[PDB]
mmCIF file of C-alpha atoms in Angstrom:
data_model
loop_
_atom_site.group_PDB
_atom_site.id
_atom_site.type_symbol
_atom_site.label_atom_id
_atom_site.label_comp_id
_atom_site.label_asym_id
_atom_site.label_seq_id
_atom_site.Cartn_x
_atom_site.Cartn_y
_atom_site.Cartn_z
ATOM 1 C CA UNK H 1107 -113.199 26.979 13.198
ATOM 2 C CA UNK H 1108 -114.427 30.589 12.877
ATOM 3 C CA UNK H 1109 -114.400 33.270 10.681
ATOM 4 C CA UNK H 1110 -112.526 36.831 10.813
ATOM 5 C CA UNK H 1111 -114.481 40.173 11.460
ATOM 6 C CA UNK H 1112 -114.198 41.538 8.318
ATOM 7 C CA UNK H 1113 -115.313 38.257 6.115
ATOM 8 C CA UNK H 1114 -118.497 38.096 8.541
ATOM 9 C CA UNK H 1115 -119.685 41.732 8.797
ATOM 10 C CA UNK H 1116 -119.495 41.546 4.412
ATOM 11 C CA UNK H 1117 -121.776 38.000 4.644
ATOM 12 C CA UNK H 1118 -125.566 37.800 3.753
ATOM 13 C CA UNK H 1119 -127.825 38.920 6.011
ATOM 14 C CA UNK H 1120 -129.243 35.497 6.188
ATOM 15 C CA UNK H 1121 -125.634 34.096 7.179
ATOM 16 C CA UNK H 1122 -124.118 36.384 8.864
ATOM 17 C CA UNK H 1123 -127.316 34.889 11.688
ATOM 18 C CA UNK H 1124 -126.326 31.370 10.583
ATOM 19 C CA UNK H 1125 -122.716 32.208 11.696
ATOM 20 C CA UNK H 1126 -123.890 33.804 15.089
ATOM 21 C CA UNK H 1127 -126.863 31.450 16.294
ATOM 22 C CA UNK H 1128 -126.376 27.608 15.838
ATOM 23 C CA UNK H 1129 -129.850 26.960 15.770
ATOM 24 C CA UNK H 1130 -130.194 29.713 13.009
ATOM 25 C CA UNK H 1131 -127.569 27.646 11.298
ATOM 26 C CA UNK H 1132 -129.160 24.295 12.198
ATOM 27 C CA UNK H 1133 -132.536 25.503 10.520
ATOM 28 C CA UNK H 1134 -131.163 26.485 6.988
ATOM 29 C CA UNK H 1135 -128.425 23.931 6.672
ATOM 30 C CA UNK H 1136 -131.927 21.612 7.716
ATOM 31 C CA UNK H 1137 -133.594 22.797 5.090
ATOM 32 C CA UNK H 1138 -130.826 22.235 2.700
ATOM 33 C CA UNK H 1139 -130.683 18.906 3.823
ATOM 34 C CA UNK H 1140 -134.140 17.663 2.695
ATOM 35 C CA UNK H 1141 -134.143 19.917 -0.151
ATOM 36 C CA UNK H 1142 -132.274 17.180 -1.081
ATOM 37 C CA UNK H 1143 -129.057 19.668 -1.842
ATOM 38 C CA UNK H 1144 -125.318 17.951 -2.164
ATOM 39 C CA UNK H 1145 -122.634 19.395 -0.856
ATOM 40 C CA UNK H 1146 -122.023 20.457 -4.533
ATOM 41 C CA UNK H 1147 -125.864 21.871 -4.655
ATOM 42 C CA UNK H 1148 -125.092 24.510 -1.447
ATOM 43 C CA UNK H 1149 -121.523 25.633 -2.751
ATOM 44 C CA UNK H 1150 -123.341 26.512 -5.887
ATOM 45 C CA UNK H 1151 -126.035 28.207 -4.070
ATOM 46 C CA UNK H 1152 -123.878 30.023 -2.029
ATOM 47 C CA UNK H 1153 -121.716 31.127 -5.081
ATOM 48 C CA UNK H 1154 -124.584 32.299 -6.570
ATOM 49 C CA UNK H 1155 -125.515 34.719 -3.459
ATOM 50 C CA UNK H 1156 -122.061 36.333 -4.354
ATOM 51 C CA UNK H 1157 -120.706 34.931 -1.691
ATOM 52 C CA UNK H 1158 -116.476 34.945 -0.061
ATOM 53 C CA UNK H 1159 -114.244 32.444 -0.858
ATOM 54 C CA UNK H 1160 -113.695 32.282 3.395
ATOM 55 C CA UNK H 1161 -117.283 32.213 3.664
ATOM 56 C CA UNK H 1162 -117.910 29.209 1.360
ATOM 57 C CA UNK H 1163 -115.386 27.496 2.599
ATOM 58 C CA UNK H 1164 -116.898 28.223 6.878
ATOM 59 C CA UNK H 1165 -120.055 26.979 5.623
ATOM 60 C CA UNK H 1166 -119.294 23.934 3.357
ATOM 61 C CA UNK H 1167 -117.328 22.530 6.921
ATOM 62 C CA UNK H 1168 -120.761 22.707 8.527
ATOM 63 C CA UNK H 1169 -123.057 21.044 6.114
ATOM 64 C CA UNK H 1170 -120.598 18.762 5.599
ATOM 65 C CA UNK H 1171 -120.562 17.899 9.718
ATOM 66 C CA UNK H 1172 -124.567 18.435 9.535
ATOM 67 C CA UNK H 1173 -124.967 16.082 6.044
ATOM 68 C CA UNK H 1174 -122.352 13.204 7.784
ATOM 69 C CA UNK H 1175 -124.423 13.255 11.080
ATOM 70 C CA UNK H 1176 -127.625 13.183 10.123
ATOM 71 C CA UNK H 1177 -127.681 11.824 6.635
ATOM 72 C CA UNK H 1178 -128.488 12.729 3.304
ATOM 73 C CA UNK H 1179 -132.118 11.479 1.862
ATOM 74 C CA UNK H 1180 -132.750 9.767 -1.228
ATOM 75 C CA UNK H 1181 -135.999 11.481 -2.774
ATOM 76 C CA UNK H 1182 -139.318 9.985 -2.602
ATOM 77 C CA UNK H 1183 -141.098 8.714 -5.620
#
């Protein structure tokens, strides 16, 4: 499950650390996670950074992994 040279020397600054570090990744996907962001919610985000079709794809897997493990939250109030 990894990603090709080219796709991650062209990704985000921001991800291209997500896709090197686990706890880098671990942090953000966190903070998607109670943001309260879908699955839906990060593709869109992550569209909207301009990003690969590879790269979307690399990262969906992992907050989908991250989302079934450790749950998704139902807002407060």
């Amino acid at each position: 499950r990894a990603l090709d040279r080219s796709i991650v020397k062209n990704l985000p600054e921001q991800f291209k650390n997500m896709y090197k570090y686990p706890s880098k990744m671990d942090n953000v996907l966190e903070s998607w996670r109670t943001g309260l962001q879908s699955v839906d919610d990060a593709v869109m985000y992550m569209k909207s950074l301009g990003m690969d079709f590879d790269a979307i794809s690399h990262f969906v897997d992992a907050y989908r992994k991250h989302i079934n493990k450790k749950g998704l939250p139902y807002a407060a109030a």
